[PDB]
Structure formats: structure tokens, C-alpha cells
Design an enzyme around this catalytic site. Sequence first.
Site, short mmCIF file in Angstrom:
data_model
loop_
_atom_site.label_atom_id
_atom_site.label_comp_id
_atom_site.label_asym_id
_atom_site.label_seq_id
_atom_site.Cartn_x
_atom_site.Cartn_y
_atom_site.Cartn_z
N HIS A 1 35.27 -31.24 -9.39
CA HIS A 1 35.93 -30.47 -8.34
C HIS A 1 35.66 -28.96 -8.34
O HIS A 1 35.99 -28.28 -7.37
CB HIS A 1 37.43 -30.72 -8.37
CG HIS A 1 38.04 -30.85 -7.01
ND1 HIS A 1 39.21 -31.53 -6.78
CD2 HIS A 1 37.61 -30.42 -5.80
CE1 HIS A 1 39.49 -31.51 -5.49
NE2 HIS A 1 38.53 -30.84 -4.87
N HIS B 1 46.09 -33.76 -8.93
CA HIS B 1 46.21 -32.49 -9.64
C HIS B 1 46.19 -31.32 -8.68
O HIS B 1 45.67 -31.43 -7.58
CB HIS B 1 45.01 -32.32 -10.60
CG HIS B 1 44.85 -33.44 -11.56
ND1 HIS B 1 43.97 -34.48 -11.36
CD2 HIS B 1 45.47 -33.70 -12.74
CE1 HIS B 1 44.05 -35.33 -12.36
NE2 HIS B 1 44.96 -34.89 -13.21
N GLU C 1 34.52 -36.16 -8.01
CA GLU C 1 35.02 -36.76 -9.24
C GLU C 1 34.77 -38.26 -9.42
O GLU C 1 35.35 -38.89 -10.31
CB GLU C 1 36.49 -36.39 -9.49
CG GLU C 1 36.73 -34.87 -9.60
CD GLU C 1 36.37 -34.31 -10.98
OE1 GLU C 1 35.92 -35.09 -11.85
OE2 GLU C 1 36.53 -33.09 -11.19
N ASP D 1 44.73 -35.03 -4.01
CA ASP D 1 44.47 -34.92 -5.43
C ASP D 1 45.70 -35.27 -6.24
O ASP D 1 46.82 -34.95 -5.84
CB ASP D 1 44.06 -33.46 -5.75
CG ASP D 1 43.23 -33.31 -7.03
OD1 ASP D 1 43.51 -34.01 -8.04
OD2 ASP D 1 42.31 -32.48 -7.04
N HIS E 1 36.98 -27.23 -13.30
CA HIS E 1 37.39 -28.15 -12.22
C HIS E 1 38.91 -28.20 -12.04
O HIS E 1 39.40 -28.78 -11.08
CB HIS E 1 36.82 -29.57 -12.40
CG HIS E 1 37.45 -30.37 -13.50
ND1 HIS E 1 37.44 -31.75 -13.52
CD2 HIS E 1 38.11 -29.98 -14.62
CE1 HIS E 1 38.07 -32.17 -14.60
NE2 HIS E 1 38.49 -31.12 -15.28
N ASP F 1 39.81 -35.43 -3.94
CA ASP F 1 39.50 -35.82 -5.31
C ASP F 1 39.81 -37.32 -5.40
O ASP F 1 40.94 -37.75 -5.11
CB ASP F 1 40.37 -35.01 -6.28
CG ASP F 1 40.08 -35.29 -7.75
OD1 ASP F 1 39.56 -36.37 -8.09
OD2 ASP F 1 40.42 -34.41 -8.58
N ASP G 1 40.52 -39.16 -7.67
CA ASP G 1 41.67 -39.46 -8.54
C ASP G 1 43.06 -39.35 -7.88
O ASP G 1 44.08 -39.61 -8.52
CB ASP G 1 41.59 -38.69 -9.88
CG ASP G 1 41.97 -37.20 -9.77
OD1 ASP G 1 42.65 -36.77 -8.82
OD2 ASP G 1 41.62 -36.44 -10.70
N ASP H 1 44.81 -28.22 -9.41
CA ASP H 1 43.54 -27.50 -9.58
C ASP H 1 43.68 -25.98 -9.39
O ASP H 1 42.78 -25.32 -8.89
CB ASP H 1 42.49 -28.06 -8.62
CG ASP H 1 42.09 -29.50 -8.96
OD1 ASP H 1 42.67 -30.11 -9.89
OD2 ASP H 1 41.17 -30.04 -8.30
N1 LIG Z 1 45.22 -29.31 -15.09
C1 LIG Z 1 44.01 -29.94 -15.60
C2 LIG Z 1 43.32 -30.62 -14.41
C3 LIG Z 1 42.20 -31.59 -14.75
C4 LIG Z 1 41.74 -32.33 -13.48
C5 LIG Z 1 40.87 -31.48 -12.57
B1 LIG Z 1 40.60 -32.18 -11.16
O1 LIG Z 1 39.42 -31.69 -10.36
O2 LIG Z 1 40.07 -33.59 -11.54
O3 LIG Z 1 41.80 -32.52 -10.33
C6 LIG Z 1 44.35 -30.92 -16.71
C7 LIG Z 1 45.18 -30.21 -17.78
N2 LIG Z 1 45.66 -31.14 -18.83
C8 LIG Z 1 46.61 -30.43 -19.72
C9 LIG Z 1 47.15 -31.37 -20.79
C10 LIG Z 1 45.98 -31.87 -21.63
O4 LIG Z 1 46.45 -32.78 -22.63
C11 LIG Z 1 44.99 -32.57 -20.71
C12 LIG Z 1 44.51 -31.64 -19.61
C13 LIG Z 1 43.18 -28.83 -16.19
O5 LIG Z 1 42.23 -29.13 -16.96
O6 LIG Z 1 43.50 -27.65 -15.91
MN LIG Z 2 40.58 -32.07 -8.39
MN LIG Z 3 42.30 -34.55 -9.85
#
Ligand SMILES: N[C@](CCCC[B-](O)(O)O)(CCN1CCC(O)CC1)C(=O)O
Ligand SMILES: [Mn+2]
Ligand SMILES: [Mn+2]
Lengths: 306, 306, 306
Positions: free
Chosen positions: C97, C122, C273, C120, C137, C228, C230, C124
Site C-alpha cells: 500500500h 487498517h 496487497e 482497508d 505501507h 487494500d 485485506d 495506514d
Molecule cells: N498499523 C500497521 C499496518 C500494517 C498494514 C498496512 B496496510 O497497507 O496493509 O493496510 C500494523 C501495525 N501493527 C502493530 C502491532 C504489531 O504487533 C503488528 C503491526 C503498521 O505497520 O503501521
Molecule cells: Mn493498506
Molecule cells: Mn490493510
Amino acid sequence: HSVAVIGAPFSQGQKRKGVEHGPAAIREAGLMKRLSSLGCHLKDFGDLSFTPVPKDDLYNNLIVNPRSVGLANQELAEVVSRAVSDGYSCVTLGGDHSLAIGTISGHARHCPDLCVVWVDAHADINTPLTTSSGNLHGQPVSFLLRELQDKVPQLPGFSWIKPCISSASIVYIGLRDVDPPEHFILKNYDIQYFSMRDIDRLGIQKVMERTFDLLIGKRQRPIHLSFDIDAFDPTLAPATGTPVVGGLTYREGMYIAEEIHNTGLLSALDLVEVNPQLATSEEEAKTTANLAVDVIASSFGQTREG
Amino acid sequence: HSVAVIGAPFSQGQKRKGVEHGPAAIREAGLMKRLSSLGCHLKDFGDLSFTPVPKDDLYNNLIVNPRSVGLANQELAEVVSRAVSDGYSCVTLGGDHSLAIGTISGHARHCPDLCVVWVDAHADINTPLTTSSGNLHGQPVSFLLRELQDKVPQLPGFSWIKPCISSASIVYIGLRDVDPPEHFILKNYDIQYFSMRDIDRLGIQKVMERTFDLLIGKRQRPIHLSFDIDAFDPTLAPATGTPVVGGLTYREGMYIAEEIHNTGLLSALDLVEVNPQLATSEEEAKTTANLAVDVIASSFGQTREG
Amino acid sequence: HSVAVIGAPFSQGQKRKGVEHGPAAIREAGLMKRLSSLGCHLKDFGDLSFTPVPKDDLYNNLIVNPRSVGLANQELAEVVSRAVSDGYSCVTLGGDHSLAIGTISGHARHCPDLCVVWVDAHADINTPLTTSSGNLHGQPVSFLLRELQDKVPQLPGFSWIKPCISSASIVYIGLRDVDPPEHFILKNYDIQYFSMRDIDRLGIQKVMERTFDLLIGKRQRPIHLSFDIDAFDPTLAPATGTPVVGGLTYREGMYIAEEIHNTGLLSALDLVEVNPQLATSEEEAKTTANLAVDVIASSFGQTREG
Ligand SMILES: N[C@](CCCC[B-](O)(O)O)(CCN1CCC(O)CC1)C(=O)O
Ligand SMILES: [Mn+2]
Ligand SMILES: [Mn+2]
Ligand SMILES: N[C@](CCCC[B-](O)(O)O)(CCN1CCC(O)CC1)C(=O)O
Ligand SMILES: N[C@](CCCC[B-](O)(O)O)(CCN1CCC(O)CC1)C(=O)O
Ligand SMILES: [Mn+2]
Ligand SMILES: [Mn+2]
Ligand SMILES: [Mn+2]
Ligand SMILES: [Mn+2]
């Protein structure tokens, strides 16, 4: 905010082996850390060991293990009563659903105006005179409802129990497998329920709105959430003794738990009927246990928006 | 309350082997006991053996098995007509959906003011001039609708057919795979349907309400429920010839059937397109047939609340 | 009606191998034929090859591949901008993403009043100061929002970026895994979102109504759909890097896409994704890619009713 976690490994409320490993499976799925992360202060009572009763013969050549279920419930009630009196919200892990006799009795002992949300595929309201199975996990509500006691005979090991709540004080959510005498009981005593059909019609949001209006619409009351894992569709919760097709979705179950949390009134929670041995695979057992943890955590404030 | 059960093992409405084992599969999943338990008085006509037609050549080098389909339906209409005239609600087990030509024709022979609820992923309203497959199971509605008749050529073996339904007397539920000329027909003739999109918007309760307003809003009419198992999502009913993603949930199917029962007007039901051979496993075959039994039982009074 | 399709095989916005094969998987699932069938005139840019950056060290001992992501995005922005200026609706296939930084910047260059629908699990919207993963991402929105720029440090390779969206101009649909700093950001800047919880309450039809009311209720604006994969439940889209249980159903996803199409204002779309290597079976990989083609096709006019 303090939470007591009590393992109640009872299996004698029914006939299928393995439900006694439910509490361990739920712990292994990360329950304690999940609750801690929400800011719950925890007391783990461990898994209780209930006193057996020798020669616990069939009552009326039908009801199985009546004394054992009675005594274990008496002991469980004590622990629950004590924990509530010490200011803990009480989480009990089952175990078959006959243990709600003990948790609700213990809970009502000093919170006699409690209300009950019973989330389940089944009504669990057969009496000893209506049950076709003899399994006490399909009868727990009948021992608890005061309007019913003229219809409920006296079981060996049950004399300590005194019907503690009114039939206006329990709402069912998720019903889809109801015995004809239970249907009669629900209609005859005007007990409120939302079957899968009502959920299909109303949506889970209105169901919770109407549930709370019925129970706490005019006064705040401590809430007892008795959640049978078999309320969920068997595709989501296969590791259980009496699966019935057409259950709650994952999102529906979370929404229920969320609304329970949002009332601020949750005082005790039963999570029953997880039976890891009934899963056809390890993955099936773990997904069921994981789902159990999700319900409990959402019930204590875990949200889907951070 | 009397119910007739007729097995119609027809496969010649399409090209895939095995759908002719649909009726045996549905019976093996316990159909009769389920109906009996509801209080249905049962007459089982068994599985019909249809008369073959020698040298049943393609019609117009496209339409397959025209005379076989025509004759089998003529024979089926005779059996259906006789059973409905003797006071039976008529349950026909398929078999591919071309047999609705016979069941609806036969039903109309005794109850000419009938209306039709057509539950299906497909509209099945192609004519011999619009079909791109040549398969009669995708054309049956075209032979039945009065308004379409000057656009429908005469097929060998079809001359006995008297188009018996006006376009305002059929409502579709579940549509999601419609050929462009079928779409044209549905709009040009103002035929009402609730596609999966409409169900997504209205919800299945409002969908049923509006369906009955259209059909029986002005007067009581006997109802013919023609139910193609492929209306359900492929995850729930894998054992069928033309599955299409994004179909009815289990609960939605049950709710449709329940509302059908609640009108008090169900006079005939087709349960079609169960093909056990197209299952990946015996589990997939049995769950599809179990689903079929659930639809029929719910249509004749089975509830999710006792 | 002209559609440009751009493969953006980027993986450096996160740490899991294989998302770079997303564009090929999606093409293999028949994307181009599906778009052609809807009457789309197609320009295929193929898969871009992005210029690598040597010695692309962690920023602040946390943020991974910053210069690589900054540069690939600058290059992608150029391509999108040129395609949009030439009169193409822009379909960009991912890839992780973080490529939305590029597609939205390029899109905004010629359509500055654009608005964004972000579908999504998430948000992001972590910044380089709030991320706990270091994965870009999970930060792309932070670089795009005008109101956030005082809280977002300057990254190597990011200097060409000019924040081009106001916080009132993006709506999220499907959120269910939000980090606490992101929740703070969403509430603090009053960014509107519909979580899975909101969908459970409102239904997807109401969600889309309100979405469009917020974005285009006062004036027509070109729409950027950033989808996304997901957002969908993991049972439907398992081949993805950060799956979260309790997502969109198939029908909800189609409904979202159908409404985007119905506005007539869709100007660019990201489908990101899809990681075919994370499938436990080729079937799992294919169904995910098939789902991706369904979204895109529906966004450009594929209907469920013909
Ligand atoms: N908030 C996440 C989002 C990942 C997904 C990105 B997407 O493009 O696919 O929507 C995940 C944060 N998360 C925090 C707790 C940890 O244990 C695992 C990662 C981050 O890495 O910042
Ligand atoms: Mn995303
Ligand atoms: Mn996502
Ligand atoms: N009504 C049941 C409910 C069992 C589930 C108990 B629980 O705590 O899990 O909700 C089942 C009655 N049923 C009657 C038909 C027979 O074929 C099988 C047993 C009973 O045994 O009373
Ligand atoms: N419209 C179909 C309907 C098939 C399902 C019949 B049923 O009783 O099960 O609802 C299918 C037409 N379709 C056109 C595109 C081709 O690629 C495949 C066949 C037809 O064959 O006419
Ligand atoms: Mn129970
Ligand atoms: Mn139960
Ligand atoms: Mn069909
Ligand atoms: Mn059909």
C-alpha cells in the site's frame, strides 16, 4: 478495574468427553495477556477441583450425575460470591453450561437484582420433567427462574439453590434449536428472546438496543453474560458438543460483546462449552479457543477501532 | 395437511452428468421423516421413469434434447396435476430446472391463479432464440410466461404447453448471473426481481414483504416456490452444476422458506439442481442435500424457535 | 471510456516477500478481458521497473527502505499523472500500500479537488514518529494529508512530496485493526471512517450513502478508490500480508465497488496487497486474485443483474 478468572472444568452436565479441557484451551489461546493489555487487574483462581459424590445414581432413571453437578455448582457459587464481594468482575471458563447454575447463584447471592443475557443456540430451560436427554447443561435456567419453581422438582444435591431471578430478568440471544416444552415455557412465562430469525429481521444492533431496554431500560443492574460458544455458527466454533447450523457470525458475536462492555455494567461472564476434543483438527480446536478469547476480551473493552 | 413427494430425475435440461441423482440424495438426507415430524401426511410417488424419445436431434442445431425434455415434462405435469387435484401440496425433487415447465404447468392445470416465487442465482428466462448454451434448464420460464409467447418458437415435443403465468405473477429472488437478453426481457416485460444487490440493500425481511405485496397483496393465491439450490452461495451448496459466488446465506434461505410457510398458501415446491457427483467430497455432497432438506422442511413449517 | 492499467510490483513498503507478484497474479486471473468486456478501452503500461537505491539504510534505525519507497513513488506518480492527463481512468495494481503515496500524488497533480475512498482493515495513517513496525505501507496517508504535515518529519527520498488531501477529503471503510496513535490521529483531525462495527450497525448501503454525502454531497469531485485486499475477511482473501478476522463479505465488497461505479466519478483505483506467496495453496492464491479482479471489474461497471 479487577477481573477474576475462574476455571470450572465441568463435564458431568452432559455426556461427551473433553469439555473439561475447555478452560485450559482458552488460557492457551492467550486470554490472560489479552485481558491485561486492556488494563484489567487480574486474579487467576486457576482451575477449580470439584468434590466428587460417590454413587451419584440417575435421578428418576433419567437425570445424569445430579449430585455431582449440584455439589460442584454449590462450590462454584461460593467462589463466585466471594470474588464479586471482593470487587472482581467474574470470568468463569467452562466446562459445560450446567455451571451457570453455580455462577448465577453465586452472583445473585449479594447482587439479587442482577440481569442475565444468555447467548446460545439453545434455551437451556428444560426442567427435570421436560428434558428428553437427562443432561443438566440443557436445564440450568429452570433452577434459576422463580416463576418456574412449582414446576421444578427437588434434585438430590440441589437443595442449597434458591431461584434468584425473575423471568423478566433474562433475555436470550441466538436461539435456533429449542425443544417444544421449552418453547411452551418461553411463551407461557413471557420470557423475552431474540432467535436467529429475529436477528435476521432486526439486525444485531436493534437486538442489543431492545435487550438493554428490557433489562436496564429503567434502572442500572449488574449484568451476567452467559455465553455458550455454540451460539456461533459451527463453521466458526466447531469444537463444541451440540453444534447447530445457522449461528451468529463473527462480527455479530463481537458486536454483542462490545455492547455488553459499553453498558459499563458487566459483573460476571460465563464462557462455556468449548470442547477441544470434538475438533477434527488442531486448527479447528484453536480457532474455537481463539474465538472464545475474542468474546471475553471484547466484553471487557477490546474494540475494533483502536 | 397433505404433501406429495415426486422424484423427477431429469438431466437432459443440461449437459452435466449426475443431477438425476438429486432426488435419491435428498431422500437419503432424511426428507420424509422431517416432513412427517411437521405433521405432514405423506404420499410418495417415488422417482418417475420418463419415456424416452428416439432420435431426439438438436433443435435448430442448438437446443439439446427438446422432445425428451418436452415429453418428460408432459408426463410430470400429469402426475403433479393429479396430486394437487387430490389435495396434496406437491414437492418435486430434481433433477435440473427444466422440470419446472412440467411442475408449474401441472400445478396451473388445477390452480390457474397461482403465482410463482423463483429462488435462483439465474433468471432461467432465455428463449430458444436467446439462449447461448442450448440448455433447456436455462429457458423454462420463457415457455410459461403469457407475454413472451410470440417471441418463443414452437419446439418439437412442446406443443402441449399452455403458457399459464402472467409476467406480474412471478417474482425472482437471488439473481446474480443474468445473460444480457434475459436482462432485456426482465426490463421490457416489467418482471419484478430482487437480485443479491437488492437483498444487500433491503435485507431479506423487506425482500419477502415486498414479494408478497406484489403477488398476494390484492388477493390470496396459491404459491408455487421454485427453488434452485444454486441460489445459495457455493460454499453452502457446492454440489450443483452452475455455482455463482456471492449467494444467499443459510439464514437468508431459511428466512425465505419460513415466510413462504407463513403465508399459509404454499401449494407446490420444486427443489432442483442438486448434483451429488459434482461434489469434491462426500461431505460436500451430503451438506448440499442436507441444505435441500432444510429448505423444504422450513417451507412446510419447521421453525428456528420450537 | 479509457482505462490505463499499471503494474506496480513494489514490496519494500513492508517486510514480507512476494507482494511484488500481485500484479501478475491479478492479470493471470483475467483482469484485462474482464475490463474489455465492459467496454473499457485499455492501455496496458505493463509492470513498471522501479529504479533501485544503493545502500538504502534505515531511517532513524526504524523506517525500512525509505529512499527506495520515496523514489519508486516519485516515478509512479509521474506515470499516473501522465495517464490521467491523457484522459485515462487509472488502475494501479500492487504491490504493497505504500504505492498509494505515488498514485494519489500523481492523480492530485491534475485533479486537485479529488477525494479518496480508502477501503482497508487498517488506517495506514501512522507517521514516522508513531509507527511501531517501521513499514511504510502503514504510513502512506500521513504523507498525503495537509493537516498532518507539521507532525511528519522529512524522509530521505520524500522531498518531492506535496501533501494534497485535506482530512475532510478522505473516508475510510472497513477499519478493524487500528494502532492507538492512529486512533488519536483520526479523532484529533476529525477524519471520517466506517469501521466494521459501523458496517454491522448501518449496513453497507447506508455506509456508502454517507460516504458520498461527506465527499460529494456539495459538489462533483473525481474519486480515488484505494482498495487494500485485506479489507475482505481472510476467509475470502487469504493471500495477503496482514490479515485480520471479521472483514467485509464478498457481497459487501461488490456493493462498495458498485456504488463507486454508480457515482460516475471514479478517476483512479489502487488494488493493493495481493501476495500470492502467502497462500497455503494455489487455490487460496487464485481465489484472492479472482476477488481482486471482481472488485476492479465492479468498480468499472460489472453488475450482478446483467
Ligand atoms: N498499523 C500497521 C499496518 C500494517 C498494514 C498496512 B496496510 O497497507 O496493509 O493496510 C500494523 C501495525 N501493527 C502493530 C502491532 C504489531 O504487533 C503488528 C503491526 C503498521 O505497520 O503501521
Ligand atoms: Mn493498506
Ligand atoms: Mn490493510
Ligand atoms: N435441549 C437440549 C440442549 C443441549 C445443549 C445444552 B447447551 O448448554 O449446550 O446449550 C438438546 C435436546 N435435544 C432434543 C432432541 C434430541 O435428538 C437431542 C437432544 C437438551 O439436552 O436439553
Ligand atoms: N443463463 C444460463 C443459465 C444456467 C443455469 C440454469 B439454472 O436452472 O441452473 O438456473 C447460463 C448461460 N451462461 C452464458 C455464459 C456462458 O459462458 C455459460 C452459460 C443458460 O444456460 O441459459
Ligand atoms: Mn448452553
Ligand atoms: Mn447451546
Ligand atoms: Mn440457477
Ligand atoms: Mn434454475
